[PDB]
Coordinates of C-alpha atoms in Angstrom, one line a residue:
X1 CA 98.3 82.7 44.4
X2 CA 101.3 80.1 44.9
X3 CA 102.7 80.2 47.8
X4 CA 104.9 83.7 48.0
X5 CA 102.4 85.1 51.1
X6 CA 103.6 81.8 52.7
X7 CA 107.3 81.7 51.9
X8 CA 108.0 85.0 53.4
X9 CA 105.8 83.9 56.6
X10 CA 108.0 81.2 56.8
X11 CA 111.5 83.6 57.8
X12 CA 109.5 85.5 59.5
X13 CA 108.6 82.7 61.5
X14 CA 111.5 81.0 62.5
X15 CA 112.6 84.9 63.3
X16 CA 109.7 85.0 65.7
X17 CA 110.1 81.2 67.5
X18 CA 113.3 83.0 69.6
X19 CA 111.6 86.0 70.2
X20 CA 108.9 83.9 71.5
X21 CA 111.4 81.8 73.2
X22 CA 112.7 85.2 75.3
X23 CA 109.7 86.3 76.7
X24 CA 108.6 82.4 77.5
X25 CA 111.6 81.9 79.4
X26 CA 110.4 84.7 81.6
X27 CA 107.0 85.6 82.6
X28 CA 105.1 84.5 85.5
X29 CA 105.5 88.1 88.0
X30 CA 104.0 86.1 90.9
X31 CA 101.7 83.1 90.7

């Protein structure tokens, strides 16, 4: 209940946007 499930999603969220952000920057082998 409350939010603790969400509060420790949140860090771990930001954490992931630059992960994210590194393999976005990339990608695309050929189109």
């Amino acid at each position: 209940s409350g939010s603790w499930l969400r509060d420790i999603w949140d860090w771990i969220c930001e954490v992931l946007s630059d992960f994210k952000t590194w393999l976005k920057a990339k990608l695309m082998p050929q189109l």
